[PDB]
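> Could you send the peptide deformylase 1 prediction when you get a chance?

Sure thing. Input:
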Amino acid sequence: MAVLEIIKHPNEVLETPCERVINFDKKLVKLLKDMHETMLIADGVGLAAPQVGVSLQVAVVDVDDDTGKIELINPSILEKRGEQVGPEGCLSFPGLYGEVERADYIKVRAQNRRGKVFLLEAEGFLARAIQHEIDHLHGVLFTSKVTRYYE
Ligand code: NI
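Output:
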Protein backbone atom coordinates (compact mmCIF):
# COMPACT_ATOMS: atom_id res chain seq x y z
CA MET A 1 0.00 0.00 0.00
CA ALA A 2 1.00 3.62 -0.38
CA VAL A 3 0.08 6.63 1.76
CA LEU A 4 -1.20 9.06 -0.85
CA GLU A 5 -0.71 12.77 -0.56
CA ILE A 6 -4.09 14.41 0.11
CA ILE A 7 -4.37 17.54 -2.04
CA LYS A 8 -5.18 20.67 -0.01
CA HIS A 9 -7.79 23.78 -1.01
CA PRO A 10 -6.29 25.27 -3.25
CA ASN A 11 -5.79 23.22 -6.16
CA GLU A 12 -7.60 23.00 -9.49
CA VAL A 13 -7.90 19.18 -9.47
CA LEU A 14 -10.44 19.64 -6.65
CA GLU A 15 -12.88 21.58 -8.81
CA THR A 16 -12.56 19.32 -11.82
CA PRO A 17 -15.57 17.07 -12.54
CA CYS A 18 -14.48 13.43 -12.75
CA GLU A 19 -14.77 10.94 -15.56
CA ARG A 20 -16.74 7.74 -15.06
CA VAL A 21 -14.65 4.65 -14.42
CA ILE A 22 -14.72 2.44 -17.54
CA ASN A 23 -11.98 -0.02 -16.73
CA PHE A 24 -12.40 -2.00 -13.52
CA ASP A 25 -8.78 -3.08 -13.38
CA LYS A 26 -5.96 -3.74 -10.92
CA LYS A 27 -4.92 -0.07 -10.85
CA LEU A 28 -8.44 0.85 -9.72
CA VAL A 29 -8.30 -1.72 -6.94
CA LYS A 30 -4.92 -0.39 -5.77
CA LEU A 31 -6.25 3.18 -5.89
CA LEU A 32 -9.16 2.21 -3.61
CA LYS A 33 -6.94 0.25 -1.23
CA ASP A 34 -4.47 3.13 -0.95
CA MET A 35 -7.28 5.66 -0.52
CA HIS A 36 -8.90 3.81 2.34
CA GLU A 37 -5.76 3.55 4.49
CA THR A 38 -4.64 7.05 3.53
CA MET A 39 -8.06 8.32 4.64
CA LEU A 40 -7.96 6.53 8.00
CA ILE A 41 -4.35 7.47 8.73
CA ALA A 42 -5.49 11.09 8.31
CA ASP A 43 -8.51 10.50 10.64
CA GLY A 44 -11.00 11.08 7.85
CA VAL A 45 -14.33 9.33 7.30
CA GLY A 46 -14.54 9.99 3.55
CA LEU A 47 -12.08 10.46 0.67
CA ALA A 48 -12.64 10.98 -3.07
CA ALA A 49 -10.20 10.27 -5.91
CA PRO A 50 -9.76 13.90 -6.92
CA GLN A 51 -8.37 14.56 -3.43
CA VAL A 52 -5.45 12.29 -4.21
CA GLY A 53 -5.10 13.76 -7.70
CA VAL A 54 -7.09 11.27 -9.75
CA SER A 55 -10.08 12.62 -11.73
CA LEU A 56 -12.23 9.47 -11.68
CA GLN A 57 -15.60 8.84 -10.01
CA VAL A 58 -14.20 6.84 -7.11
CA ALA A 59 -14.68 7.45 -3.40
CA VAL A 60 -14.64 5.52 -0.15
CA VAL A 61 -16.35 6.23 3.19
CA ASP A 62 -15.89 4.43 6.48
CA VAL A 63 -17.73 5.67 9.54
CA ASP A 64 -19.07 2.84 11.78
CA ASP A 65 -17.27 -0.49 12.27
CA ASP A 66 -20.47 -2.53 11.87
CA THR A 67 -21.18 -0.88 8.52
CA GLY A 68 -17.53 -0.57 7.69
CA LYS A 69 -15.83 0.44 4.49
CA ILE A 70 -18.06 1.39 1.56
CA GLU A 71 -16.30 1.85 -1.78
CA LEU A 72 -18.31 3.74 -4.38
CA ILE A 73 -17.57 3.77 -8.10
CA ASN A 74 -19.67 5.88 -10.48
CA PRO A 75 -22.20 6.60 -7.70
CA SER A 76 -25.47 8.37 -8.27
CA ILE A 77 -28.14 9.34 -5.73
CA LEU A 78 -31.52 7.92 -6.75
CA GLU A 79 -33.53 9.28 -3.84
CA LYS A 80 -33.19 11.83 -1.05
CA ARG A 81 -35.60 12.41 1.84
CA GLY A 82 -35.54 14.64 4.90
CA GLU A 83 -32.87 17.09 5.97
CA GLN A 84 -30.11 17.34 8.55
CA VAL A 85 -28.05 20.35 9.56
CA GLY A 86 -24.70 20.08 11.22
CA PRO A 87 -20.94 20.47 11.02
CA GLU A 88 -18.96 19.28 8.05
CA GLY A 89 -15.21 19.15 7.40
CA CYS A 90 -12.93 17.88 4.64
CA LEU A 91 -9.39 16.49 4.61
CA SER A 92 -8.62 18.90 1.76
CA PHE A 93 -9.41 21.88 4.04
CA PRO A 94 -7.53 21.10 7.25
CA GLY A 95 -9.21 22.46 10.34
CA LEU A 96 -12.05 24.09 8.39
CA TYR A 97 -15.57 23.24 9.56
CA GLY A 98 -18.88 24.76 8.53
CA GLU A 99 -22.58 24.09 8.92
CA VAL A 100 -24.04 22.32 5.91
CA GLU A 101 -27.58 21.11 5.28
CA ARG A 102 -27.74 17.66 3.55
CA ALA A 103 -30.50 15.17 2.85
CA ASP A 104 -30.99 12.87 5.87
CA TYR A 105 -31.90 9.70 3.93
CA ILE A 106 -30.41 8.72 0.56
CA LYS A 107 -30.66 5.78 -1.79
CA VAL A 108 -27.46 5.31 -3.82
CA ARG A 109 -26.68 3.28 -6.95
CA ALA A 110 -22.99 2.59 -7.48
CA GLN A 111 -20.54 -0.02 -8.68
CA ASN A 112 -18.04 -2.12 -6.78
CA ARG A 113 -14.43 -2.97 -7.80
CA ARG A 114 -15.58 -5.57 -10.33
CA GLY A 115 -18.15 -3.25 -11.92
CA LYS A 116 -21.23 -4.80 -10.32
CA VAL A 117 -24.11 -2.43 -9.56
CA PHE A 118 -25.46 -2.31 -5.99
CA LEU A 119 -28.06 -0.31 -4.14
CA LEU A 120 -27.34 1.32 -0.83
CA GLU A 121 -29.57 3.15 1.63
CA ALA A 122 -28.03 5.44 4.22
CA GLU A 123 -29.08 8.01 6.76
CA GLY A 124 -27.51 10.52 9.09
CA PHE A 125 -23.77 10.86 9.33
CA LEU A 126 -23.10 8.15 6.81
CA ALA A 127 -25.50 9.77 4.36
CA ARG A 128 -23.77 13.13 4.96
CA ALA A 129 -20.38 11.63 4.23
CA ILE A 130 -21.58 9.95 1.06
CA GLN A 131 -23.19 13.13 -0.24
CA HIS A 132 -20.00 15.10 0.47
CA GLU A 133 -17.84 12.58 -1.37
CA ILE A 134 -20.14 12.30 -4.36
CA ASP A 135 -20.01 16.09 -4.67
CA HIS A 136 -16.19 15.83 -4.94
CA LEU A 137 -16.64 13.55 -7.94
CA HIS A 138 -18.46 16.35 -9.73
CA GLY A 139 -15.94 19.02 -8.80
CA VAL A 140 -18.09 20.44 -5.97
CA LEU A 141 -16.53 21.38 -2.62
CA PHE A 142 -18.39 21.73 0.66
CA THR A 143 -17.46 25.37 1.03
CA SER A 144 -19.97 26.08 -1.73
CA LYS A 145 -22.75 24.82 0.57
CA VAL A 146 -21.65 26.12 3.97
CA THR A 147 -24.31 28.41 5.50
CA ARG A 148 -22.05 29.54 8.36
CA TYR A 149 -18.60 28.73 9.70
CA TYR A 150 -18.02 28.19 13.43
CA GLU A 151 -16.28 30.63 15.77
NI1 NI B 1 -14.06 16.43 1.20
